[PDB]
Every structure is written in structure tokens, then in C-alpha cells.
């Protein structure tokens, strides 16, 4: 019995106090939907959860599934719901690297041991590291930002850096 999809809308990265809606979606006509948060192991018998204002406590892993007749579906892929703006934004810079390689620096005060960098676009390009230094191989011009967080709580992220408007030759 095929798994549903679980989406966060408009996004699974959610600034504190901003809204998000989790939506489980299987076949039509089904009897019941079950949405769960994993860490706290609390759950609901409905397909949709509206979060009017994002909180530290709602960030975490979620999944869902549905039941038709008396039979359970395979569970959705896991949804990583992240709260952003829990810390001051970091500051992003870029330098050359070897060949077509660009080296970015995501600089921050607090001891953070995780960093996430992305290029705006369709689709988005994502990069990660534990050191605040991120190589982009064969980098494309674009609008870059980074986030810093702790592996002690990998679902609470900083505000995004101010965008870096990169042009590569």
C-alpha cells in the first residue's frame, strides 16, 4: 500500500514566528490520515497541520501515513522541519579556489559546528560542512546565502546570511 507525500508549505525552512503547513497526501477516498512528530512522539488523525507561527519546539522530523479499510500504508519520506532565525545571521564571503572552484566562508561568533550554503534558483544547489568553509566545484554565478547551526540541535538554524551576489569567471 503506497506511501503518501508529506510537504511543508511554503517551505520546510521556516523563520521563527512565520507560518507553515504540513500536508500529507495519498490516494483519494482513503479512510484516515496519521501525521506524527518523531522526537516528541505526538500525532494527529488528520492530514493537515497548520503552524501559524513557527517555534523552536515544532522543529524536528515528521512523517505520515494513511489507513484504508483496516490497512496501513507505507510511511511517507521523512520531513525535516527546520526553524530559522534562532540566531544572528552569519556573514558570507567568497575567494578563488583551484580551477573552476570557489571557496566560500560562512563566518560566525558562536561556536557552531554545522553550516549550510545554497544558491537561489530552480532547483536550488545545497552544500554542507562542519568547518565554516565550503568549496563549490565548477561554481555558477548566482545568489548565495548560508546558515549556521549546531549538531546538538540540527533543526534550529540561524537567520540566513545577507545574500552574496556571486559572479564567476
Amino acid at each position: 500500500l503506497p506511501k503518501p507525500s508529506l510537504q511543508a508549505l511554503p517551505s520546510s525552512l521556516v523563520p521563527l514566528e512565520k507560518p507553515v503547513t504540513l500536508r500529507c497526501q495519498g490516494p483519494p477516498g482513503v479512510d484516515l490520515y496519521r501525521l506524527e512528530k518523531l522526537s516528541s512522539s505526538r500525532y494527529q488523525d488528520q492530514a493537515v497541520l497548520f503552524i501559524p507561527a513557527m517555534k523552536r519546539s515544532l522543529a524536528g522530523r515528521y512523517r505520515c501515513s494513511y489507513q484504508n479499510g483496516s490497512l496501513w500504508s507505507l510511511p511517507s519520506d521523512q520531513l525535516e522541519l527546520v526553524a530559522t532565525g534562532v540566531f544572528a545571521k552569519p556573514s558570507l564571503s567568497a575567494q578563488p579556489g583551484s580551477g573552476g572552484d570557489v571557496t566560500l566562508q560562512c563566518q560566525t561568533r558562536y561556536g557552531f559546528d554545522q553550516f549550510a550554503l545554497y544558491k537561489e534558483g530552480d532547483p536550488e544547489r545545497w552544500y554542507r560542512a562542519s568547518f565554516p568553509i565550503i568549496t563549490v566545484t565548477a561554481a555558477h554565478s548566482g545568489t548565495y546565502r548560508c546558515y549556521s547551526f549546531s549538531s546538538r540541535d540540527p533543526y534550529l538554524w540561524s537567520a540566513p546570511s545577507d545574500p552574496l551576489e556571486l559572479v564567476v569567471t
Binding site: 484516515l32 496519521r34 506524527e36 512522539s41 500525532y43 488523525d45 489507513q67
Partner: peptide, 15 residues
């Protein structure tokens, strides 16, 4: 009267 509807489904299982 007649018996009520079934109760809701149980909690998710453990890991």
C-alpha cells in the same frame, strides 16, 4: 441501543 463506532487508531509503534 446499538453499539457505537470503533475507537480511533492506536498510537504509532515504537522504533
Amino acid at each position: 441501543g446499538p453499539p457505537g463506532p470503533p475507537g480511533p487508531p492506536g498510537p504509532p509503534g515504537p522504533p
